[PDB]
Design a protein around this ligand. Structure first.
Ligand SMILES: *[C@@H]1O[C@H](CO)[C@@H](O[C@@H]2O[C@H](CO)[C@@H](O)[C@H](O)[C@H]2NC(C)=O)[C@H](O)[C@H]1NC(C)=O
Ligand SMILES: *[C@@H]1O[C@H](CO)[C@@H](O[C@@H]2O[C@H](CO)[C@@H](O)[C@H](O)[C@H]2NC(C)=O)[C@H](O)[C@H]1NC(C)=O
Ligand SMILES: [Zn+2]
Ligand SMILES: [Zn+2]
Ligand SMILES: [Zn+2]
Ligand SMILES: [Zn+2]
Ligand SMILES: [Zn+2]
Ligand SMILES: [Zn+2]
Ligand SMILES: [Zn+2]
Ligand SMILES: [Zn+2]
Ligand SMILES: [Zn+2]
Ligand SMILES: [Zn+2]
Lengths: 196, 106, 106, 198
């Protein structure tokens, strides 16, 4: 479990005078990742991030964050710079051929990057569609493209599987439709299971 | 065994084995209601009509009917970080019903 | 002293001296909650999170912390005819909180 | 002392639990004082000003009020010649210590034709509702009842009133709670704690 969740806990407890907008917060690590390197046709890194986000029907989510670790991937001459941009798309239709070069996508967030470290992408829209799945089109995944600029790192990318460090994860903020009624009901049943 | 009132109760999740799913906090003040609901029942125990009736009945038939119990009234929520049944990390600002706000006779 | 449950309790107002103001009824079924809140607390006793916590703490430290008490949950009203403080005859179809509907551990 | 009307209302409510009444709270208010003026040539009818002490808590919303009167020909000889007439109750706004009906300001409540000797029910909700919101100013909490005897009837047709001790007038006030039982059960509790140590 990410320390981001832990710091959020510390934030809530130290600021009793300042109540947060969302009660329920969940962390979802990436389930699987499909990575395609930059080509002359598509000069950028392509990543399809598969998650397993499952928020209960009785809950109404408010915000979702996609946290990515931007880093120059240990290339020689890495002191030459680290600057570019990245774009995340909600994948509707995929295809086991190329990434970006196929399927249907809905653009979520455009992010310019500079510092090595964690970036936060507000991709609430995508998760809301994932919650109301309505079967039909298979989703619960998104595509992130990383565009390296001229005077920058040749290996500018986000840390993804099959890597083991600084992997992408979701942070879903949620509240209860019944204003905490149905929530505490299920919390009780949960605790009874954990009781024995 | 004096007067129904709220007392201090520090609960460590490690002690009760809830450290397997509760991430934070490690321990918290849950409070406890101690004392008896002796005649007469005043405002400070927010009694019900049944509690008052039973207490009077107890006075008449102490060998057959017991007196009201000192239990928590309304409960205060605490902040809890924990893992779901699916192992999903979950943080809730208001995890209702973890500590005692008021006590009373019921 | 087995399982927290509702038991029969017939209350005569003459016995408790409430016949001085209660006109009707003379007696009614008030019910009583008997039994202990022993581990584990199941759905049928509508436990709170604190009750579950306290029960486990009691199970762990029986000499320091007591267990949850078997008390009435929701209470059912009865029809009551009585005289006011001013001596005014008063009839209320729903005199709330006179009898036990459900029991539970708190 | 508690009227059997209240007792019968209890029995009605309890034996018919399948049929919930429109009003939860019911109170009985017996007449506090009565000012009676016999029929005169100028005003050919019996006049009664009935003073009550109706006091319903502010947080309560009353729905109906009933004025229960005992109509009877006062044991006159040749009363067997018939018993038929009418009676009218007025909500007294401004009174005057002179005569009844012949003075003051009244607002008419109910006109009632009478036949049987016995208890009559008058729908006088309006008057009590006005009494609850007293707002000081004009002194009220009282009403005037006139009893009109018809031709082929008793010359002494009237309602039973003080200083008599039997079949006296009384109010039946039906009420519910504005706070939907919250403030109601709170005060019931506080009262009961008083009756606990009683
Ligand atoms: C991903 O999340 C889904 C929930 O959407 C999990 O699917 C559940 O699995 C349990 C046990 O296998 C079933 O009882 C539920 O009916 C499933 N729910 C649905 C909606 O199908 C799934 O197990 C999760 N997978 C991983 C790897 O975490
Ligand atoms: C008429 O009714 C009113 C209200 O019910 C009575 O007012 C009470 O006055 C006493 C004075 O000592 C107060 O202690 C009570 O609290 C008042 N009642 C209420 C409900 O507040 C008044 O006494 C009654 N009149 C008579 C002659 O009994
Ligand atoms: Zn080429
Ligand atoms: Zn640039
Ligand atoms: Zn840019
Ligand atoms: Zn360059
Ligand atoms: Zn929930
Ligand atoms: Zn005792
Ligand atoms: Zn809350
Ligand atoms: Zn007529
Ligand atoms: Zn005559
Ligand atoms: Zn009231």
């Amino acid at each position: 479990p990410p320390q981001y969740m832990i710091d959020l806990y510390n934030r809530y407890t130290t600021d009793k005078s300042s109540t947060p907008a969302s009660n329920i917060v969940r962390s979802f690590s990436v389930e699987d990742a499909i990575s395609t390197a930059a080509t002359e046709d598509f000069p950028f890194q392509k990543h399809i991030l598969i998650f397993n986000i499952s928020i209960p029907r009785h809950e109404q989510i408010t915000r979702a964050e996609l946290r990515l670790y931007v880093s120059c991937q240990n290339d020689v001459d890495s002191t030459h710079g680290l600057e570019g941009s990245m774009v995340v798309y909600d994948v509707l239709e995929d295809s086991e051929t190329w990434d970006q070069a196929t399927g249907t996508k809905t653009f979520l967030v455009s992010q310019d990057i500079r510092d090595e470290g964690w970036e936060t992408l507000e991709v609430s829209s995508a998760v809301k569609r994932w919650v109301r799945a309505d079967s039909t089109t298979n989703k619960n995944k998104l595509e992130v493209t990383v565009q390296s600029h001229r005077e920058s790192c040749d290996t500018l990318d986000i840390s993804v599987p099959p890597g083991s460090k600084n992997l992408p994860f979701f942070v879903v903020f949620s509240n209860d439709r019944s204003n905490g009624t149905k929530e505490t009901r299920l919390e009780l049943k949960e605790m009874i299971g954990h009781e024995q | 065994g004096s007067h129904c009132q709220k007392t201090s109760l520090r609960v460590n999740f490690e002690d009760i084995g809830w450290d397997s799913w509760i991430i934070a906090p490690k321990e918290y003040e849950a409070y406890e209601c101690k004392g008896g609901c002796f005649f007469p029942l005043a405002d400070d125990v927010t009694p019900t009509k049944h509690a008052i009736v039973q207490t009077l009945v107890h006075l008449k038939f102490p060998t057959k009917v017991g007196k009201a119990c000192c239990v928590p009234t309304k409960l205060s929520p605490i902040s809890v970080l924990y893992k779901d049944d699916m192992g999903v990390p979950t943080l809730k600002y208001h995890y209702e019903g973890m500590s005692v706000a008021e006590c009373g006779c019921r």
